[model samples]
Target: PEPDMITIFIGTWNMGNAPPPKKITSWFLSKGQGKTRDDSADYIPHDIYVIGTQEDPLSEKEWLEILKHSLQEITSVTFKTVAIHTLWNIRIVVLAKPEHENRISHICTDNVKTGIANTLGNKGAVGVSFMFNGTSLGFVNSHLTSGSEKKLRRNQNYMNILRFLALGDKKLSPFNITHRFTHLFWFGDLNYRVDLPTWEAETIIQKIKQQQYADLLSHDQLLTERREQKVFLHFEEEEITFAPTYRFERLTRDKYAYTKQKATGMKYNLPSWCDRVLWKSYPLVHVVCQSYGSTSDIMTSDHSPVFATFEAGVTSQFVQGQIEFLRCYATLKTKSQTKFYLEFHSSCLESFVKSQEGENEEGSEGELVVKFGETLPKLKPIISDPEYLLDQHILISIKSSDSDESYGEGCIALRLEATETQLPIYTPLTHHGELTGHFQGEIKLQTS
Candidate 1:
């Protein structure tokens, strides 16, 4: 086993339904302060980048292009936006330098809606989880309920996001769930505001003018709630030395802004720290936060973009194993003495189909076609769990060597106990119209 030191760059912001600003390289730089900072001098050229946004106008192409061009020349190698997940305007876009392109596996994405009976996609969290260098990581970008007084709603949203925002399998030690990931980076416009009167809050905000937040942060809702183990339990945040990230009056540099409702004549808001980045890792692994700050100058929305860089010591394993195919024979018989072959299709068994093929029509030969016989040829399946391999069904579709129609189809449930090697199973095959058949076998399948 060898350790791969990887750097993960994460950003979370609310676009406020606005297109991205002209430039965003500073947000991606190492120091996390872009304005007037030498763009090329501090570029981190991260191993992986996760950009999560909320209140976006769904300008997917526009944002992707801007980020790509922002890091184009400064990076050591060419990178591409690999995972782009958007639930309406809430989005999480991932980019990488392609160093471990081939090793990246089990990439998963899921979204949870917390608004309007959990059916509306208006406000929710979008997540992307994957395995890199054999280490599992989960990234959640979210937009919770808003309102200075709706702190309970925001807390509930966080609970629902963690409870339901599922990813890869947690069964076989993948840590596919939210906290299960070795390094979980959760951030976004959480919408937790300060608990203070509009006028009184600004009086405390004056401390920020002298570069201090001790007075203002005393009434912070997130800190108060999280202190009692209410939400974001076990997670950690780097020291907060920057000003609040939300409600910076749009189109202004380093200026705090508030919104006025059209219905209410009164208008007020304390510039709260809604945008933030928090991370947690397994105790066995040590993760060091290199830098944590915000780019308050690029005020595309009311929320300033927050970023963090981390160096996680992850150990990549080398496994020497064998893939043993199920030793079984299906008596698949199509009337009229038709020639057919067995086809296997599963999320983890697609390679089996590609391993065996025949040329009947032109020569592309992508299907597994062999005459039905006593023993099926073993596929060099390029793949896992026998018991909790829940959906690994042998979707045996008996197709004629002549055409593409399935003559006999039987879904053999693939399940085995820990000590069991051979499991007997039987399933009836339903042909299209008249050529019905039966598939029976004591399967010996185990892939490690």
Candidate 2:
């Protein structure tokens, strides 16, 4: 059998409060690489884009416009913004192809501050969770404390964010964040630094110039902590082949600078791989990493943007079916006028039946059961063109009891059978809740 899959593109960048760029298509697709959206031979179209950014001053609405216009310019497929959430400087946007819009639902977002008194928004995380194709996916963008020796602090911040999402007011609904989603992508400027001293770090910087990234991995604090399950225990990251993404001069090629000023009470900059992306996939969800690197071409921020492209496996067939029954109301007994009736227009009745025409076994014979409590009203078949169904003014006289006034609820039930005179196996496709209203001398079902 062929593999079931969906292509997903994720990009995370700390904009450093930079204004929205005129063009970001090259940044997302990479400069001078990959086939354009028009290519149908080898280019696989992306199903979703989960782009996250930090230190952005733009409002959620403003950012959405910028992202939508930029993406539409590159892909032939029309895209719709499905989700957008922002907490302070952290923002995460999710966009899906138009064909998948109806399949996406149950969208929710939350954010928490981790900076100064836990109220300031300088540092924190923002998350977006949603259901797609019956599977849940969670995406979080976080910016933790920045320091070489604050590894424990970063881990603590991660825990705090996790706790807030799992138990806080903005917690994920219908499930917990930790184990609820089938796939999770957490990316941002995590601020994890190298464990080596300044002199040793500078020595490795020369090796980095020679493309010896594996040697530098030995001194990576994030890797050490992950091995010990201190943080991001089960999360997996692609091999880091790109140079350090932080502590560089803006708009320069390979020009390292001391970003931290001792006079300002900040320690001297010891270059580290601060910006990173990681993912955790459940058993059935397979995530294959295609490309992982820093987009060194963009020169707007000191911190280079990092991105990862991957494909996730999914189930083959799409199976979502439903029939909508709109609510109808009717007024009951007034002080002067006492009448009980439902006022419904032909358009309303037509909408209900046409939505289910041939929805079941194609040539099935069906019955429309209009019931008031346990009493079934004999409704005459009205229209028979598309499908035969009952009409308005089907009266049901209530047998008033000793109580001051009589009150009852009504509902409509649809039952269909595949063959005629086969006992009409009743397969109800809809169950409208109790439809009730006031009453007078005569019940009127009128269309206004």
Best model number under TM-score: 1
User: Candidate 2: lDDT of 222?
Assistant: 87
Q: Return the lDDT, model 2, position 82.
A: 81
Per-residue C-alpha lDDT of model 2 across residues 279-350, encoded as one tens digit per residue: 866533468887677765676776777777778865422211121222222232222222222211121132
Candidate 1, poorest ten consecutive residues by summed lDDT: 354-363
lDDT of 1 by residue, 177-290 (tens): 433466789899988877777767557557767777776777788888888767776678887777778777688745666646663244556778898788867543668887
Candidate 2 — which residues are off by over 4 angstroms?
1-3, 30-44, 115-120, 166-175, 262-264, 316-448
The candidate 2 region of ten consecutive residues with least summed lDDT is 424-433
In terms of lDDT, which candidate is strongest?
A: 1
